[PDB]
């Protein structure tokens, strides 16, 4: 009653570069032989091999020491569910569209991906280099217009699934964690009429992000914050060394003035449902909303994040 054994050669991988020769029995599923298995994002764990699969590359989970090392070196994570979440996302993002809008790779709206579109548009306007080879390779392709792998990696690194509501500031925080910001430096001073003054120094990601005001000029002049004594103290920027800065705040009506910022994100909605748009300051003000594009000489809206150019700043206060 035994059926004659039939096999094909396939390759397994965790980085799509280093390949691992395998011989699979076509009477057993991929899952029975490799564990969870994916073909360009599609879950084929429960699929039995097809003749058309011969010679193709399948992603698997890091289930031996060689694969564990290859996966860490490429992705800089050892989260056991990472590859499954990346493939699950990729199965969707490979079907998204990535139109060039005003010279930048955007994303046509789908699956609540507006926060990803404005993040991707923002990255193309600031100086930033990623550390994991996976992000280096995928971001290069995204700049060229093939952003499916990059978007699926953002989702995996942020632990977001396709369709989940995302926050732009949080998303940028994750991407900045995987970028080389080592030389970025920020010095702050906080002045309380009662308690005196206290200087602090921040480095890396914390040197380029601030939550509380959208205006870089106001940050240099001073913003009011609580002091432990109960009074409000004044916090201001003393010194800044970085190629950009990111200023964030809860969404509030805010006026964006041409030539005074690099780009910004706008959020219309509430804590459960909303929509992001991107504003970029070039020869005029362009509003990029996924595949849509409009222009205006002035802009006012519920802004959440503003990016500014920088190199070296020292206060005169
Ligand atoms: Cl890079
Ligand atoms: Zn005080």
Curated annotation (Swiss-Prot):
It is a multi-pass membrane protein. Changing residue 78 to L: Increased cleavage of ubiquitin in vitro; no effect on ISG15 cleavage in vitro. It catalyses: Thiol-dependent hydrolysis of ester, thioester, amide, peptide and isopeptide bonds formed by the C-terminal Gly of ubiquitin (a 76-residue protein attached to proteins as an intracellular targeting signal). It comes from the Viruses. Changing residue 114 to A: Unable to remove host IFIH1 (MDA5) ISGylation. A zinc finger (C4-type) spans 192-229. Residues 5-60 form the Ubiquitin-like domain. May form homohexamers. Interacts with N protein. Responsible for the cleavages located at the N-terminus of the replicase polyprotein. Participates together with nsp4 in the assembly of virally-induced cytoplasmic double-membrane vesicles necessary for viral replication. Antagonizes innate immune induction of type I interferon by blocking the phosphorylation, dimerization and subsequent nuclear translocation of host IRF3. Also prevents host NF-kappa-B signaling. In addition, PL-PRO possesses a deubiquitinating/deISGylating activity and processes both 'Lys-48'- and 'Lys-63'-linked polyubiquitin chains from cellular substrates. This is Papain-like protease nsp3. It comes from Severe acute respiratory syndrome coronavirus 2 (2019-nCoV). The chain holds residues 1564 to 1877 of 7096 of the full protein.
């Amino acid at each position: 009653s035994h059926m004659e054994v039939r096999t094909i050669k396939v390759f397994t991988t965790v980085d799509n570069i280093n390949l691992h020769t395998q011989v699979v029995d076509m009477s057993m599923t991929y899952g029975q032989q490799f564990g969870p298995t994916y073909l360009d994002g599609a879950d084929v764990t429960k699929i039995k091999p097809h003749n058309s699969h011969e010679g193709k590359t399948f992603y698997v989970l890091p289930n031996d020491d060689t694969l564990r090392v290859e996966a860490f070196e490429y992705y800089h994570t050892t989260d056991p569910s990472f590859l499954g979440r990346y493939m699950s996302a990729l199965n969707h993002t490979k079907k998204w569209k990535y139109p060039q809008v005003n010279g930048l790779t955007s994303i046509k709206w789908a699956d609540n991906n507006c926060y990803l579109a404005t993040a991707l548009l923002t990255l193309q306007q600031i100086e930033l280099k990623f550390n994991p080879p996976a992000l280096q390779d995928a971001y290069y392709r995204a700049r060229a217009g093939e952003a499916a792998n990059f978007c699926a990696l953002i989702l995996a690194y942020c632990n977001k699934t396709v369709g989940e509501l995302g926050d732009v500031r949080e998303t940028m925080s994750y991407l900045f964690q995987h970028a080389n910001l080592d030389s970025c430096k920020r010095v702050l001073n906080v002045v309380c009429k009662t308690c005196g003054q206290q200087q602090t120094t921040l480095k890396g990601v914390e040197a380029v992000m601030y939550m509380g005001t959208l205006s870089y000029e106001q940050f240099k002049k001073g913003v009011q914050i609580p002091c432990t004594c109960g009074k409000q103290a004044t916090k201001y920027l003393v010194q800044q060394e970085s190629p950009f800065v990111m200023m964030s705040a809860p969404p509030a009506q805010y006026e964006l003035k041409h030539g005074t910022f690099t780009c910004a994100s706008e959020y219309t909605g509430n804590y459960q449902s909303g929509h992001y748009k991107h504003i970029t300051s070039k020869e005029t003000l362009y509003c990029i909303d996924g595949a849509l594009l409009t222009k205006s000489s002035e802009y006012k809206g519920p802004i959440t994040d503003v990016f500014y150019k920088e190199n070296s700043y020292t206060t005169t206060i």
